[PDB]
Tab-separated table of C-alpha atoms (C1' of nucleotides) and ligand atoms in Angstrom:
chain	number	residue	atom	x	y	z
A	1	UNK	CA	28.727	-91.728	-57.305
A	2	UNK	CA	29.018	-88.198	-56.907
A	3	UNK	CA	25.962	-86.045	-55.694
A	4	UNK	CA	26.486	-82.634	-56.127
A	5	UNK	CA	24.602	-79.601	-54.320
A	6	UNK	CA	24.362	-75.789	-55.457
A	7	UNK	CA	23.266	-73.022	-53.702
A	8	UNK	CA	21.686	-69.760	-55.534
A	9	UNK	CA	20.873	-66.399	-53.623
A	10	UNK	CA	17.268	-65.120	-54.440
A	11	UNK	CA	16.855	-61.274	-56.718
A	12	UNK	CA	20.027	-61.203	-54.256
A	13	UNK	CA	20.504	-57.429	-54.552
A	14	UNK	CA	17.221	-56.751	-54.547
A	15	UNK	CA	16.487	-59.105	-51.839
A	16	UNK	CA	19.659	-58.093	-49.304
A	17	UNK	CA	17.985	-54.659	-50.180
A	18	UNK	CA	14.919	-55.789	-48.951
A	19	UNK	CA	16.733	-57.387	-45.801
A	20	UNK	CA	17.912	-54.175	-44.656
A	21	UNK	CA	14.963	-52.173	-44.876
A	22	UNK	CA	11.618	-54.480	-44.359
A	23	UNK	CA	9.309	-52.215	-45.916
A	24	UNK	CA	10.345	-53.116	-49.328
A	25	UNK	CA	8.874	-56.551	-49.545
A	26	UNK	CA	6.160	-56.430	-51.873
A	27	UNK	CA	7.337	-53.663	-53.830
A	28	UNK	CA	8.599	-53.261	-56.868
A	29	UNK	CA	12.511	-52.567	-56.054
A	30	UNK	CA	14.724	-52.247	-58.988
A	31	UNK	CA	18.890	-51.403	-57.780
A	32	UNK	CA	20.963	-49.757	-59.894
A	33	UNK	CA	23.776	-48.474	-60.869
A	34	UNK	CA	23.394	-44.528	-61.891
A	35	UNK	CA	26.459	-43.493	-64.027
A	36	UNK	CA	25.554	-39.682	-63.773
A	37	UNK	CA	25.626	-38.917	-66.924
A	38	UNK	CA	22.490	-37.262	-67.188
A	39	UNK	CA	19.475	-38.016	-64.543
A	40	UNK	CA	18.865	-41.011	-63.731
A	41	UNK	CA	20.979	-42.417	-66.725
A	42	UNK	CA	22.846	-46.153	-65.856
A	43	UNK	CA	21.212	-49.727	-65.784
A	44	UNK	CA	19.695	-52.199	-63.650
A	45	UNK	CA	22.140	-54.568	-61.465
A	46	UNK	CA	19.036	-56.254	-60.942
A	47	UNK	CA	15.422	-56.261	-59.537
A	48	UNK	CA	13.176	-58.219	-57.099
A	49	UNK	CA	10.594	-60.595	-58.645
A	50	UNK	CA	7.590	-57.797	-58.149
A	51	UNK	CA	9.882	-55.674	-60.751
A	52	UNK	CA	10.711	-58.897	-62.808
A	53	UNK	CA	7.427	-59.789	-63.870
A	54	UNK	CA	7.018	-56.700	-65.884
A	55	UNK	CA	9.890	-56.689	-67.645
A	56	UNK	CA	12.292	-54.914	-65.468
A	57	UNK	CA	15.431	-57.005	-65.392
A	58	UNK	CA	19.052	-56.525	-64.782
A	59	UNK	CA	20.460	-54.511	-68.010
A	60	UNK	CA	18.087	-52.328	-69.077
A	61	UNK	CA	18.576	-48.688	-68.756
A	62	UNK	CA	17.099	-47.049	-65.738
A	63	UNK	CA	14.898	-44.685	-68.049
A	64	UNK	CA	13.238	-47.668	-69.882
A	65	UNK	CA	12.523	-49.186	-66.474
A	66	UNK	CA	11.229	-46.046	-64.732
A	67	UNK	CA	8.927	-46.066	-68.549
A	68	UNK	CA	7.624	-49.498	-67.422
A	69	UNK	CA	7.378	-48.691	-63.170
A	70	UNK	CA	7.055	-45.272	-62.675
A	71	UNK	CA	6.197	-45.718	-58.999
A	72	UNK	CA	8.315	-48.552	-58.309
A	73	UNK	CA	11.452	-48.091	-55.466
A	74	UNK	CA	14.685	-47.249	-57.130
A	75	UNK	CA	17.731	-47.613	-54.959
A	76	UNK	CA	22.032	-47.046	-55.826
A	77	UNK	CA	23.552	-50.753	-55.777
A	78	UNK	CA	25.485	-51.081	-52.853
A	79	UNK	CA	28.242	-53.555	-53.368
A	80	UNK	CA	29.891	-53.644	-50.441
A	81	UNK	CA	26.856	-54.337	-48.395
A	82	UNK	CA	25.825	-57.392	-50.482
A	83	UNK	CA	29.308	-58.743	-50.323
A	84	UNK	CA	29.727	-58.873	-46.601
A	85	UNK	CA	26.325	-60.735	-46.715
A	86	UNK	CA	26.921	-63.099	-49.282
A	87	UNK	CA	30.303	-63.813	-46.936
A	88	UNK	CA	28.778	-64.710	-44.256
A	89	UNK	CA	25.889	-67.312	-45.874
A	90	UNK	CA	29.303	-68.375	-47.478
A	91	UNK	CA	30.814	-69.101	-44.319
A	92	UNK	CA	27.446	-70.852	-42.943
A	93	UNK	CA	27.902	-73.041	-46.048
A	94	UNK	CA	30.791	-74.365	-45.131
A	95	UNK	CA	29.315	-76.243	-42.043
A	96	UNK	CA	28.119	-78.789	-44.927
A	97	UNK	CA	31.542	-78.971	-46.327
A	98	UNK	CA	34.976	-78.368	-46.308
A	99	UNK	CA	34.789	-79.168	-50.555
A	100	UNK	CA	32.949	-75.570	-51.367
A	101	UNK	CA	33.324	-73.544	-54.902
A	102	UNK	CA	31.882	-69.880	-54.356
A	103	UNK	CA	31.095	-69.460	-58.146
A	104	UNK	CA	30.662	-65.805	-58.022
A	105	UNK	CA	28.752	-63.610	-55.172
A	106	UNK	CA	25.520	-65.670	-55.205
A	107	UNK	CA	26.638	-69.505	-55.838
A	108	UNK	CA	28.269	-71.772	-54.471
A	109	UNK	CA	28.834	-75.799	-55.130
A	110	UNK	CA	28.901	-78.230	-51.974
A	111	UNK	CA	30.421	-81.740	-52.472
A	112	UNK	CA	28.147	-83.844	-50.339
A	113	UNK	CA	29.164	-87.144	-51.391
A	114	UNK	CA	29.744	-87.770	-48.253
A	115	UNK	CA	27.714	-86.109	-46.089
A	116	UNK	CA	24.836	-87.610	-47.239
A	117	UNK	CA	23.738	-90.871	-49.462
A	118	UNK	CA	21.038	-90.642	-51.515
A	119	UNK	CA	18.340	-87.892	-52.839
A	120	UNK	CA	16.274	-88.448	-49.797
A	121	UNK	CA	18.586	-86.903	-47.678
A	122	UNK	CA	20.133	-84.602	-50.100
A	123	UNK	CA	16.944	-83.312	-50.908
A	124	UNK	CA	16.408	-83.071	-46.804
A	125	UNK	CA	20.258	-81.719	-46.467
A	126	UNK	CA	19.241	-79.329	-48.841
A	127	UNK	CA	15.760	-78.044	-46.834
A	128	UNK	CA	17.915	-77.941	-44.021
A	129	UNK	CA	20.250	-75.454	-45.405
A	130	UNK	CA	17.418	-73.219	-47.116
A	131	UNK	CA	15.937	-73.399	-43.957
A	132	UNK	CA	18.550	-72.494	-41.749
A	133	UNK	CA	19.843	-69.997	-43.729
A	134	UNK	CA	16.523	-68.053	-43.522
A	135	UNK	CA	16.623	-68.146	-40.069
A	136	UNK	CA	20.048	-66.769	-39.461
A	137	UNK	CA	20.507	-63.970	-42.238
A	138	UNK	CA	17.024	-63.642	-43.616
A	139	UNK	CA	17.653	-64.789	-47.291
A	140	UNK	CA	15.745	-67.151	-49.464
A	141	UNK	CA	18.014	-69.209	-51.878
A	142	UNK	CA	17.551	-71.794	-54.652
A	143	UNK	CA	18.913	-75.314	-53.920
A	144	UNK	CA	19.735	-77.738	-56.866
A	145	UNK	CA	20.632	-81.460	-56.621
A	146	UNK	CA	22.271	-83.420	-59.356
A	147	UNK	CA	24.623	-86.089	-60.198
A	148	UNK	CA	27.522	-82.580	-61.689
A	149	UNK	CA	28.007	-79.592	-61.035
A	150	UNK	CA	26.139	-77.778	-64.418
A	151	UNK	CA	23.163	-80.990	-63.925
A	152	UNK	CA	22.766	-79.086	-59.781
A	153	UNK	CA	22.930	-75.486	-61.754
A	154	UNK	CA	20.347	-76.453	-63.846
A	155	UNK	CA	18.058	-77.890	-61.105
A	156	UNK	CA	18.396	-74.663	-59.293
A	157	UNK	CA	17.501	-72.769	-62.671
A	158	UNK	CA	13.872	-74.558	-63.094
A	159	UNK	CA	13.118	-73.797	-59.287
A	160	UNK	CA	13.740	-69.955	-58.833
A	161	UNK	CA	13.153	-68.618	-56.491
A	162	UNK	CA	13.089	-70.216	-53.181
A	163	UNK	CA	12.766	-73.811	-54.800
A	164	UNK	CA	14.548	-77.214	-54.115
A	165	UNK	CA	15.280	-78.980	-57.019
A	166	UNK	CA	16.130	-82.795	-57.467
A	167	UNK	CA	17.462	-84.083	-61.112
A	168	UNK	CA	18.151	-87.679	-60.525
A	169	UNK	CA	20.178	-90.321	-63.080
A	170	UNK	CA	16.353	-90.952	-64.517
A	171	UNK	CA	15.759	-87.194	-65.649
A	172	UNK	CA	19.792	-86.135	-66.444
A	173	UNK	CA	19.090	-88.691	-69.349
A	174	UNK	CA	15.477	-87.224	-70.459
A	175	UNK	CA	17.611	-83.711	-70.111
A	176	UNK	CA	20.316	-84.090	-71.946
A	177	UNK	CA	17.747	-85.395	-74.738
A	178	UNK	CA	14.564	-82.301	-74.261
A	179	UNK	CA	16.757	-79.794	-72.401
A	180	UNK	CA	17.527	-76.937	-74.804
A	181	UNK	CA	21.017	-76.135	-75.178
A	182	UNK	CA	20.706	-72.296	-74.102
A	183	UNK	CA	19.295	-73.321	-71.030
A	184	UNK	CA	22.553	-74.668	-70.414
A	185	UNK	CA	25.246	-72.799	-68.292
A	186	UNK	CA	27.672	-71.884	-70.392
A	187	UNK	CA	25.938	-71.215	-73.374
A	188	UNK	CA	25.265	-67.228	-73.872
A	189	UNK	CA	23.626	-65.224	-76.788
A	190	UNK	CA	26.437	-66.059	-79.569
A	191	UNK	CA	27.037	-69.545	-78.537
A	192	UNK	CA	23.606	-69.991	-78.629
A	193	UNK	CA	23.016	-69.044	-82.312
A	194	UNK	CA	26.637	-70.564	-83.216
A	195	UNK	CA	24.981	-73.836	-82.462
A	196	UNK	CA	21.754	-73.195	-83.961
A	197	UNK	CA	23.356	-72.994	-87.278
A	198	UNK	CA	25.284	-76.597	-86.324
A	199	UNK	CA	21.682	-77.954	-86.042
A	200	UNK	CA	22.339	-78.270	-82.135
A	201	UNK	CA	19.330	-77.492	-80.686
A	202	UNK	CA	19.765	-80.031	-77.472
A	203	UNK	CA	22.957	-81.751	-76.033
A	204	UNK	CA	22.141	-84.561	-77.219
A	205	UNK	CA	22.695	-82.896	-81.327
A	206	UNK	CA	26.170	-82.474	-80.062
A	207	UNK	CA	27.073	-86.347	-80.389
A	208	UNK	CA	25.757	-86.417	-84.282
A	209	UNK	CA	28.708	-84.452	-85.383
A	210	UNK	CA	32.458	-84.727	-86.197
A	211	UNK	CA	34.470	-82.932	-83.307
A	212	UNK	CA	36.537	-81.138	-85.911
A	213	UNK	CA	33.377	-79.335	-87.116
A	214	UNK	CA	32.466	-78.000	-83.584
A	215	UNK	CA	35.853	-77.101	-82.547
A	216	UNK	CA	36.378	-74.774	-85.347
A	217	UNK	CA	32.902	-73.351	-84.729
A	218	UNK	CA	32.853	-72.950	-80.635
A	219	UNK	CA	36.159	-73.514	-79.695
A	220	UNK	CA	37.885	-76.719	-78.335
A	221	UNK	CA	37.104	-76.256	-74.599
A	222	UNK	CA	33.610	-75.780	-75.564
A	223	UNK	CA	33.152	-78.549	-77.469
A	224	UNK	CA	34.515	-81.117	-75.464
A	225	UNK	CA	32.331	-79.483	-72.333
A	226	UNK	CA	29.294	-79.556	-74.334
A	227	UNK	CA	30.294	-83.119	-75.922
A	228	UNK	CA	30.966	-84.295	-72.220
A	229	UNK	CA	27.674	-83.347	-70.848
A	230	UNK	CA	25.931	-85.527	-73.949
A	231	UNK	CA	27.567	-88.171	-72.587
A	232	UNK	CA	26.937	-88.184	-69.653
A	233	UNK	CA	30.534	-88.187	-68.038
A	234	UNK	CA	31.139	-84.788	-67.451
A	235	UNK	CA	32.523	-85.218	-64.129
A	236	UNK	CA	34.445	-82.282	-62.738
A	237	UNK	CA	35.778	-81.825	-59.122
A	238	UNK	CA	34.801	-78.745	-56.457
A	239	UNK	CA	37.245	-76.216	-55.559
A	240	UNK	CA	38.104	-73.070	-53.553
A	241	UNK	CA	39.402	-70.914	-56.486
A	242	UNK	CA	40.781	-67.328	-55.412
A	243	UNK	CA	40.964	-64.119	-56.866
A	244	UNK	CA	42.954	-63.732	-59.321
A	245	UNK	CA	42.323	-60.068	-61.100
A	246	UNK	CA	40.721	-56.752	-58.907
A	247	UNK	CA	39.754	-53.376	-60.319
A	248	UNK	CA	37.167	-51.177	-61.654
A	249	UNK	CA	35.651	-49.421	-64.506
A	250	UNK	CA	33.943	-45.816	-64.113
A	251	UNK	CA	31.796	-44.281	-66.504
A	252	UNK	CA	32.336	-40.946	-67.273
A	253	UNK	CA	30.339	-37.449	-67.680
A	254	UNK	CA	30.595	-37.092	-70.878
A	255	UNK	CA	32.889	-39.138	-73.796
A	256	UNK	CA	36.373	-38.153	-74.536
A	257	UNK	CA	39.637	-38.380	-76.366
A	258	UNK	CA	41.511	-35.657	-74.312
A	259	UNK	CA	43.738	-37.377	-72.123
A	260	UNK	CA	43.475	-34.813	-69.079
A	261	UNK	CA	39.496	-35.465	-69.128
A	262	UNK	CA	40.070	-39.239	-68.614
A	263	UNK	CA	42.935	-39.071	-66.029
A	264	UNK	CA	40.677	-37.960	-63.169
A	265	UNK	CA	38.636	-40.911	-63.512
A	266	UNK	CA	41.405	-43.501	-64.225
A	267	UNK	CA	42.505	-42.262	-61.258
A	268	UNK	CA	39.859	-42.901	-59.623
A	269	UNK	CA	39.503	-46.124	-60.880
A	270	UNK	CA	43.264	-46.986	-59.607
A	271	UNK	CA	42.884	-46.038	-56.132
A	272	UNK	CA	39.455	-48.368	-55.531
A	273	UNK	CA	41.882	-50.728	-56.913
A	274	UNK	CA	44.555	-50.378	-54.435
A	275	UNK	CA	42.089	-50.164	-51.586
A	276	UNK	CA	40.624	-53.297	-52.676
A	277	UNK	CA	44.163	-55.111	-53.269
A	278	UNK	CA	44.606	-55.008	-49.532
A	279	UNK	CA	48.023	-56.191	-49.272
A	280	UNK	CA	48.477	-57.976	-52.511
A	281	UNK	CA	50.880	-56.800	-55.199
A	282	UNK	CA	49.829	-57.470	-58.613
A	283	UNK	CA	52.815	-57.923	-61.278
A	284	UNK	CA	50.084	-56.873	-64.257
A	285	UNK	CA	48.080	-54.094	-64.681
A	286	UNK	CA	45.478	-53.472	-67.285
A	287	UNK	CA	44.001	-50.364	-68.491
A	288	UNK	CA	40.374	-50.865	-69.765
A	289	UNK	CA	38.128	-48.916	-71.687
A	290	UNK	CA	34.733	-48.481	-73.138
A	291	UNK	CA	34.471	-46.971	-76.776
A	292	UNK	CA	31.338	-45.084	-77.421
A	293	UNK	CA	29.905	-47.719	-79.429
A	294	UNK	CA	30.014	-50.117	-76.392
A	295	UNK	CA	32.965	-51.996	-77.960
A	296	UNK	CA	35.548	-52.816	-75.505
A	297	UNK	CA	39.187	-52.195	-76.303
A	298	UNK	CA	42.403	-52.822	-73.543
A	299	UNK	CA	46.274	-52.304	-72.973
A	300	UNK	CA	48.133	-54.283	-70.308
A	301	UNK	CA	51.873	-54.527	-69.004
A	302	UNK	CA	53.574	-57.447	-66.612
A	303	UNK	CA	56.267	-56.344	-64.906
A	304	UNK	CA	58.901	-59.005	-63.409
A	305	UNK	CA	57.994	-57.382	-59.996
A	306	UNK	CA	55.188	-55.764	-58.128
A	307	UNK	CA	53.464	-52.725	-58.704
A	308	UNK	CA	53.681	-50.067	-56.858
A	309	UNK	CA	50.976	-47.337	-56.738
A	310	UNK	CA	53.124	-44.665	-57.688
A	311	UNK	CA	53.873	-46.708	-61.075
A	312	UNK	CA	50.485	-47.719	-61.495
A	313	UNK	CA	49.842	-44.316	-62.132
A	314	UNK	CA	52.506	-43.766	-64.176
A	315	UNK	CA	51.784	-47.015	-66.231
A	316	UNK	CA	48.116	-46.456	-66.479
A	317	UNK	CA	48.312	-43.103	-68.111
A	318	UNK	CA	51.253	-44.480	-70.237
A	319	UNK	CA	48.352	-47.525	-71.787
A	320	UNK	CA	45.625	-44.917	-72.179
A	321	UNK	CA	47.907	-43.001	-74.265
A	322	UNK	CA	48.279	-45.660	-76.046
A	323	UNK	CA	44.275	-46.541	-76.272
A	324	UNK	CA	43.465	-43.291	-77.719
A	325	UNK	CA	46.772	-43.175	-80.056
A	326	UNK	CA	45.136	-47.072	-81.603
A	327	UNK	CA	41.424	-46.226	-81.778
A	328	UNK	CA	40.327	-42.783	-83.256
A	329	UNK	CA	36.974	-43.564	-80.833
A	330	UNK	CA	35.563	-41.464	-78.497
A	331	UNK	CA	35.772	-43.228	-74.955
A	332	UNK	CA	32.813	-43.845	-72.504
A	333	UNK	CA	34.301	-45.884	-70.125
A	334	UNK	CA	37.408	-45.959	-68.216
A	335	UNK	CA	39.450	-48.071	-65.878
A	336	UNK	CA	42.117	-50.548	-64.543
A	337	UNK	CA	42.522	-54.383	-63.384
A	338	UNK	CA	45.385	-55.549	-61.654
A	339	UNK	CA	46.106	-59.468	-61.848
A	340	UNK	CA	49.489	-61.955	-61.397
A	341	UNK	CA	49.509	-61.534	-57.808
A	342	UNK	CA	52.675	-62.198	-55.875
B	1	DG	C1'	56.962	-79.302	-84.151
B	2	DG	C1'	55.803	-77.393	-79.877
B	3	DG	C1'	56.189	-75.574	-74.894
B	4	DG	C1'	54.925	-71.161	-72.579
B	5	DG	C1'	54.071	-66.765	-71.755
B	6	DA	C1'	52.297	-62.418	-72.858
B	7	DA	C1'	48.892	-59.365	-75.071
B	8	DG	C1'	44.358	-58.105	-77.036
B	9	DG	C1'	39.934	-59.788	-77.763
B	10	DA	C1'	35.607	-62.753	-76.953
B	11	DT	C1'	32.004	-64.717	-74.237
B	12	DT	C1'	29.458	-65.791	-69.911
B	13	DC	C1'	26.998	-64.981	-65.646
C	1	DC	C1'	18.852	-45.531	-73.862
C	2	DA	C1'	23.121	-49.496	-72.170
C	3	DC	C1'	26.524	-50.255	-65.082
C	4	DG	C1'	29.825	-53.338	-63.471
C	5	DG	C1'	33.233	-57.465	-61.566
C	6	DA	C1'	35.849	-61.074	-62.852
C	7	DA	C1'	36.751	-65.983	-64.898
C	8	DT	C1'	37.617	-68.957	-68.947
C	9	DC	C1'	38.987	-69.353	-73.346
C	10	DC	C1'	40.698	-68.002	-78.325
C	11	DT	C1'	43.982	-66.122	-81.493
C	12	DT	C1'	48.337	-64.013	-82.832
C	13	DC	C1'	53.138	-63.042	-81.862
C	14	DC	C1'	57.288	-64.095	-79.892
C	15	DC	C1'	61.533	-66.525	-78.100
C	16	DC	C1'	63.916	-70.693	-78.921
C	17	DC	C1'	64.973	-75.478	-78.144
D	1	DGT	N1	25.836	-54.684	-61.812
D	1	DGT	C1	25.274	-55.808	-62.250
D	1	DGT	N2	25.047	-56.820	-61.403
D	1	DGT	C2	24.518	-57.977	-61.818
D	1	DGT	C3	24.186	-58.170	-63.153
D	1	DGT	N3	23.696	-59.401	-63.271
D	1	DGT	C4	23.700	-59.958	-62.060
D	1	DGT	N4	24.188	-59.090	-61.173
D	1	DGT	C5	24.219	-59.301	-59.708
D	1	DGT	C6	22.832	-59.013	-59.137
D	1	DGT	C7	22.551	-60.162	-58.362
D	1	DGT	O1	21.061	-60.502	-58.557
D	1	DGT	C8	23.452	-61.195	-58.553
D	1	DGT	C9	22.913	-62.356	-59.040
D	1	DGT	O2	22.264	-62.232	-60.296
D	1	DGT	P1	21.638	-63.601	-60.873
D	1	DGT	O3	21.188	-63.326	-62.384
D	1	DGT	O4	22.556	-64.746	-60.764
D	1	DGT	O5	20.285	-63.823	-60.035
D	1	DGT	P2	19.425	-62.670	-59.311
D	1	DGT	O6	19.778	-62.855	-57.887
D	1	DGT	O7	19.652	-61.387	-60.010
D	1	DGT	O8	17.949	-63.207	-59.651
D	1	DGT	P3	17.573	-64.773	-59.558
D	1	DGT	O9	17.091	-65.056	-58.051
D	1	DGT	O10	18.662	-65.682	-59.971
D	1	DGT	O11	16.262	-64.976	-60.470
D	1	DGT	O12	24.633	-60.612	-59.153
D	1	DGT	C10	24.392	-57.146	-64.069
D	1	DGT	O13	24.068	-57.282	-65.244
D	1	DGT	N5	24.943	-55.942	-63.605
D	2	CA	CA1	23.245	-66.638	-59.416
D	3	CA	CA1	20.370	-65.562	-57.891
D	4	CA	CA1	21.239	-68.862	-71.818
DNA sequence: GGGGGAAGGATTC
DNA sequence: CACGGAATCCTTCCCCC
């Protein structure tokens, strides 16, 4: 009986970008995230639909994007910023129910089984909320309605941006028979051509073969998701998960092996940490790093109490050691994550 | 046989 | 050319009932 509503933030970089300073709208604007290498080397976080449409999307290097929109406005990403706005629609959200999931910055899940009672009014709940969220902080969002939670993600997909999307009973049935598998959430790049080679081309392929066969090919969890979701009784409950890791990865001027030309920037890395922590003590800490050929290779440590920064230092230095003793490869990126808070 | 954690890796958005 | 944050899940190893 469940009706389930999701709520996605439009080219939200881009657009918070655009929030801030008015002018942009209209223009091209592509954020990134310059690592300093050399000029203007790095990637996109992401870029507003004007950039999209050409190609420009979040991942690409800066240079092959300033190749395709030479004029268009290039700004640094601005985390913080972003953050403290996605917050606050968060906390607007919340007015529509207590049962929220904030996916990740942009997303969030309302449970308004109760709340409401049929499409009509979910569909009307849901131009209220697009609405009134425009009015208050300026921000166009994608709303998608569905029976689940990946059946209101997928409605949300097929209307960006600024859309309302409805997939009733009728259409989850005609989806989980047309719908193409990548299109579903969950399923990346290497799932993606796992499944091809299964002959799964739509959820609905999924029922057609023995468990055992898909398990050893995707994984248990996956399988059972994706064989849920073919029939129909995927079914899973909203809630108000917390963080559970912080840190931060830096890239670095140049690639390395010597361990005094990393240290400055896992240092770095360790001290955003702590200033994020903000009165949590992590029991883990991870030191994570980016070979040169974009393969990424970590060392971790729990400790049966909480770590201090002053051994977080110690500790870090102690797993890169280690890093560079495993791997004979040159490193690109560096940089910690702290998790098992107390 | 199997719980459970810990560690390193894999995949997604 | 190719940044960055963090969650879920997989596999192997390990201790030990
Ligand atoms: N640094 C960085 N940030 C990313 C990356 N991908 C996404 N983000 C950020 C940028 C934001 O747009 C935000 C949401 O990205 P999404 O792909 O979910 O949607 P976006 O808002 O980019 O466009 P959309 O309205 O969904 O078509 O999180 C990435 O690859 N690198
Ligand atoms: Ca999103
Ligand atoms: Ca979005
Ligand atoms: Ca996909």
């Amino acid at each position: 009986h469940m009706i389930v509503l999701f709520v996605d933030f439009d080219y939200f970089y881009a657009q918070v970008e655009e929030v801030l300073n008015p002018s942009l709208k209209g223009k091209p604007v592509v954020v990134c995230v310059f690592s300093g290498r050399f000029e203007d080397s790095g990637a996109v976080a992401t870029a507003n639909y004007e950039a999209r449409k050409f190609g420009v999307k979040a991942g690409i290097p800066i240079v092959e994007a300033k190749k395709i929109l030479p004029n268009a406005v290039y700004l640094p990403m601005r985390k913080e910023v972003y953050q403290q706005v996605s917050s606050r629609i968060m906390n607007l959200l919340r007015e529509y129910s207590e049962k929220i999931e904030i996916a990740s910055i942009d997303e969030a899940y309302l449970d308004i089984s109760d709340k409401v009672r049929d499409y009509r009014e979910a569909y009307n709940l849901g131009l209220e909320i697009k609405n009134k969220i425009l009015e208050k902080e300026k921000i166009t969002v994608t709303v998608g309605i569905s029976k689940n939670k990946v059946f209101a993600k997928i409605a949300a997909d097929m209307a960006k941006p600024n859309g309302i999307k409805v997939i009733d009973d009728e259409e989850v049935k005609r989806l989980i028979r047309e719908l193409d598998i990548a299109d579903v959430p969950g399923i990346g790049n290497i799932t993606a051509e796992k499944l091809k080679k299964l002959g799964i081309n739509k959820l609905v392929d999924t029922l057609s073969i023995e468990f055992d066969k898909l398990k050893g090919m995707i994984g248990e969890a996956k399988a059972k998701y994706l064989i849920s979701l073919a029939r129909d009784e995927y079914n899973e409950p909203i809630r108000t998960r917390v963080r559970k890791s912080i840190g931060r990865i830096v890239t670095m001027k140049r690639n390395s092996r010597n361990l005094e030309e990393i240290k400055p920037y896992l240092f770095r890395a360790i001290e955003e940490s702590y200033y994020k922590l903000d009165k949590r003590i992590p029991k883990a800490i991870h030191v994570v790093a980016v070979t040169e050929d974009l393969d990424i290779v970590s060392r971790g440590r729990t400790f049966p109490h909480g770590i201090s920064k002053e051994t977080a230092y110690s500790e870090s230095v102690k797993l890169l050691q280690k890093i560079l003793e495993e791997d004979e490869r040159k490193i690109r990126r560096i940089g910690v994550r702290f998790s098992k808070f107390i």
